[PDB]
């Protein structure tokens, strides 16, 4: 991998050979084709799932939902052409993305139809039917979560990813709980390190010891980060990981900060979230031993938009931990209001 | 950090940010021109080391040895300005670079006046005395190993827009047993990863699960690799690390291969070494329960230059491990000849 780079703190410049990790989260990627195997086989799997009482699917990540949306119509066309009476409905996804107990099957053979959908870009209608294969959406009361699928896809290749941007997928044959490794990359160089995937970008630094620096998340998955793609795993207790192990947090010393316990009650209902160790505008934090115990995350602004100025914590290390979202600022559990009725506070929606 | 990438495996020309780690091992010889900061203080440190009973130095890495061999002159010149009577003699290195019990002092205050170093870096004139502060060489008898120093320097800053970037070293203040972290880099991307430093380049990939791929060695240190710069440290026993922990091997699953134990008696005396999992030319390795027990590693050719064509092992996975050196091709400890007696072959020297 011949390449080059330019420093920003300095002007050191060079090409050469090495290994290069790229940040694709804030860049927002670009248009992806997301070839979901052969739509013929996807149709066969969809039919086979219905025969065994499988209602819908729950998207692990935002890529899966977009792939479903982009292949919706042609799948319906294939179903209509062959002897099938079923409809697929796709809807907006919400966070956090919960785990489904079912897994889509792998058909032994393929539907007897004219296989013309390989590479078909939507733009086709089908006959509506009473029975529908709902994908996410708000189709919950129609069928509860216990009859949904989850994490059944496995990235196959990146054929012509530079310009055609084709991500090839497949249906896996293994039950698993870990996130897809084919899109994970982490590196350390001197006094800086980073863990990243298509939705997570986490940065760590050494200051008297390795610690968490900053994180930017556009999705909240529920798989678990594999160990092989993690730095310095041993010697840490899961009670201390800032990003919960249940929300796909790495098992690392780099994922820790001293004076803070694991954040399992944060505002994980948002769409875009940034973790920053800083005070938000108009707020201050003091350290006192008489402050309250841990509680749900509270927004810095009242429902009407008023701001609470004074907050206290017990045994936290400055700068304080906070979450940044388009709604406003959310503090961690360790920090509690110094003087404020709990009625005006917007409590984080506990995720279960 | 703007990017520069042309991946020939996939032919993707990207341009973004991230973190990049380069392979600098193959061009090590003259990558820097040091001038360790303030040699007027290094002179006082050497004088005090001589006074206290510290009579020599055993180099930790080839970089330090070249630093000595480049600053030998001006240092002697500074000695010949205040009446000090000592002569620094710098010799050649031998592998492995053993460890020294003592540490170089940190002078309380610099010499009364040593500005003669200003404007005279390399071309200087000095005198000679009887006292010797020997660096390296076949000179143990003049300063016994129990009085040599070792591992007394840290890199403060480095990196410049020049073929030879100036490095600002300093005298370490605290005792330590681990290698300097400021020049270590490692990363993993999909199915490939690498650990490296200025003299180590090690590669691993995924097949069933992660395993060692290859390594390139130009020096054999004796410091310990820090944990923070290691991937997946949990669950590995130190008896399976292919590169021994004492010889600066990392504690990782990436540093393991199935069917082989630690290599404590490999041909670690050669100048530079490369590790490959392939046959030595003109030879084959078998797997046989009846083969011999572990022992010292043997060279594939006799001292007379004749080749040995058949080798065996008991429980090793093919292809076999081997060492590529300037002398010739060697086989691992688990691998012994089938019929020819081992006393006829060349045995490697003892290291501990």
């Amino acid at each position: 991998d011949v390449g080059c780079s330019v420093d920003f703190s300095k002007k050191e410049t060079r090409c050469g050979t090495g290994v290069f990790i790229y940040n694709d989260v804030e860049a927002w990627r670009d248009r992806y084709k997301y070839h979901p195997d052969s739509p013929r086989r996807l149709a066969a799997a969809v039919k086979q799932a219905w025969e065994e009482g499988i209602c819908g699917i729950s998207s692990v990540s935002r890529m899966e939902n977009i792939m479903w949306k982009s292949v919706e119509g042609e799948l319906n066309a294939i179903l209509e052409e062959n002897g099938v009476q079923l409809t697929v409905v796709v809807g907006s996804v919400k966070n956090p993305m919960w785990r489904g107990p079912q897994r889509l099957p792998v058909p032994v053979n393929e539907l007897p139809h004219g296989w013309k959908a390989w590479g078909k870009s939507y733009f086709v209608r089908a006959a509506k039917t009473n029975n529908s294969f709902v994908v996410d959406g708000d189709t919950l009361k129609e069928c509860p979560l216990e009859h949904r699928a989850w994490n059944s896809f496995l990235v196959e290749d990146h054929g012509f990813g530079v310009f055609h941007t084709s991500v090839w997928l497949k249906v896996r044959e293994d039950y698993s709980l870990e996130c897809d490794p084919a899109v994970i990359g982490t590196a350390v160089k001197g006094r800086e390190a980073a863990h990243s995937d298509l939705g997570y970008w986490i940065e760590s630094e050494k200051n008297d010891t390795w610690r968490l620096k900053r994180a930017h998340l556009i999705e909240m998955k529920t798989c678990e980060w594999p160990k092989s793609h993690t730095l310095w795993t041993d010697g840490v207790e899961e009670s201390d990981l800032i990003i919960p192990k249940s929300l796909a947090g790495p098992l690392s010393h780099h994922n820790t900060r001293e004076g803070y316990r694991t954040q399992v009650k944060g505002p994980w209902h948002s769409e875009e979230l940034e973790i920053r160790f800083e005070e938000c505008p108009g707020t201050k934090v003091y350290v006192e031993e008489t402050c309250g115990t841990r509680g749900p995350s509270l927004r810095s602004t009242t429902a009407s938009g008023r701001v609470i100025e004074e907050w206290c914590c017990r045994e936290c290390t400055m700068p304080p931990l906070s979450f940044r979202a388009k709604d406003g600022c959310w503090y961690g559990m360790e920090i509690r209001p110094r003087k404020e009725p709990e009625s005006n506070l917007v409590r984080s929606m506990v995720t279960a | 950090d703007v990017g520069c990438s042309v991946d020939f495996s996939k032919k993707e020309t990207r341009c973004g940010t991230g973190v990049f780690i380069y392979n600098d091992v193959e061009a090590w010889r003259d990558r820097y021109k040091y001038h360790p900061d303030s040699p007027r203080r290094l002179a006082a440190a050497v004088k005090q080391a001589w006074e206290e009973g510290i009579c020599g130095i055993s180099s930790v890495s080839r970089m330090e040895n070249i630093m000595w061999k480049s600053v030998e002159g001006e240092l002697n010149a500074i000695l010949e300005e205040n009446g000090v009577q000592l002569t620094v003699v710098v010799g050649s290195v031998k592998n492995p670079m053993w460890r020294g019990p003592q540490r170089l002092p940190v002078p309380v205050n610099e010499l009364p006046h040593g500005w003669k170093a200003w404007g005279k870096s390399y071309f200087v004139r000095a005198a000679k005395t009887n006292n010797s502060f020997v660096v390296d060489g076949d000179t143990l008898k003049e300063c016994p190993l129990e009085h040599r120093a070792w591992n007394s320097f840290l890199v403060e800053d480095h990196g410049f827009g020049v073929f030879h970037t100036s490095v600002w070293l300093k005298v370490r203040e605290d005792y330590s047993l681990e290698c300097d972290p400021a020049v270590i880099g490692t990363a993993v991307k999909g199915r490939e990863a690498a650990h490296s430093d200025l003299g180590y380049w090690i590669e691993s990939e995924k097949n069933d699960t992660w395993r060692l791929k290859r390594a390139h060695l130009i020096e054999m240190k004796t410091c310990e690799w820090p944990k923070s710069h290691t991937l997946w440290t949990d669950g590995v026993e130190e008896s399976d690390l292919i590169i021994p922990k004492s010889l600066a091997g990392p504690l990782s699953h990436h540093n393991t291969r199935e069917g082989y134990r630690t290599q404590v008696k490999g041909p670690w005396h050669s100048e530079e070494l490369e590790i490959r999992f392939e046959e030595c030319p003109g030879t084959k390795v078998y797997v046989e329960e009846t083969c011999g027990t572990r022992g010292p590693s043997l060279r594939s050719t006799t001292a007379s230059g004749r080749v040995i064509e058949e080798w065996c092992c008991r429980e090793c996975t093919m292809p076999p491990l081997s060492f590529r050196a300037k002398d010739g091709c060697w086989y691992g400890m688990e691998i012994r000849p089938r019929k020819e007696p081992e006393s006829n072959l060349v045995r490697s020297m003892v290291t501990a």
Partner: antibody, heavy 120, light 109 residues
């Protein structure tokens, strides 16, 4: 193919000793499925101990944290448990169970079990 | 913290042909990763129900499970003479994988 799990290596041992348990397998490959060890003390319920993922990760229960070690031999198609610092409190029947292929997270196939007695 | 599973009752008495109700409760939401096992004296457990509503291949149609979240139930339509055993409920959401205490089913006398 028929599927089985068969334990071996039980017996009588003194306090502070060590022993190795072997759980063979047939009809499938242990590399592609999660595997665990479960035990049942005389006159008591069931107890899970440790698990090894198909990728290679391992987890342990506190009662044996550090004293035991789980590993698999990908070539011999076997699952191993290494026991050290044994006590009379470890007396129980030990099982090895297979993680279900498709039916959620469930021990689809169990073994017969082996008896381990720790007494001086 | 670990997930605790509390079975109830400790034991119940019933005859052939009655309806038996067994409840299993979890200390935290576990989605629907719940399982039921049946163990006879001197034997290894057996696998009956997964996902809190699905039946394994070969399980008689009498058994049926329901519930979501924390409260789960097991029911038998027509008790048979060969259903005398103990029942355990297990959760498979995350490690450590905990079991239930178990309930003994006995004949009325």
């Amino acid at each position: 193919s028929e599927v089985q799990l068969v334990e071996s290596g039980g017996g009588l041992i003194q306090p502070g000793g060590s022993l190795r348990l072997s759980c063979a397998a047939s009809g499938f490959t242990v590399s592609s499925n999660y595997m665990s060890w479960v035990r049942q003390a005389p006159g008591k319920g069931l107890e899970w101990v440790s698990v090894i993922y198909s990728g290679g990760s391992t987890y342990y229960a506190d009662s044996v944290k550090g004293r035991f070690t789980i590993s698999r031999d990908n070539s011999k198609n076997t699952l191993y448990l290494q026991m050290n610092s044994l006590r009379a409190e470890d007396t129980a029947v030990y099982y090895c169970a297979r993680w279900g292929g498709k039916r959620g997270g469930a021990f689809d196939i169990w073994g017969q079990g082996t008896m381990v007695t720790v007494s001086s | 913290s670990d997930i605790q599973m509390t079975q109830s009752p400790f034991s119940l008495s019933a005859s052939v042909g009655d309806r038996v109700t067994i409840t299993c409760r979890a200390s935290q939401s576990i989605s629907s990763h719940l399982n039921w096992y049946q163990q006879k004296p001197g034997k290894a457990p057996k696998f009956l129900i997964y996902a809190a509503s699905s039946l394994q291949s070969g399980v008689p149609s009498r058994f049926s499970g329901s519930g979501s979240g924390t409260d789960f139930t097991l029911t038998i339509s027509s008790l048979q003479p060969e259903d005398f055993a103990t029942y355990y409920c297990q959760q498979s959401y995350s490690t450590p994988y905990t079991f239930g205490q178990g309930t003994k089913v006995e004949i009325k006398r």
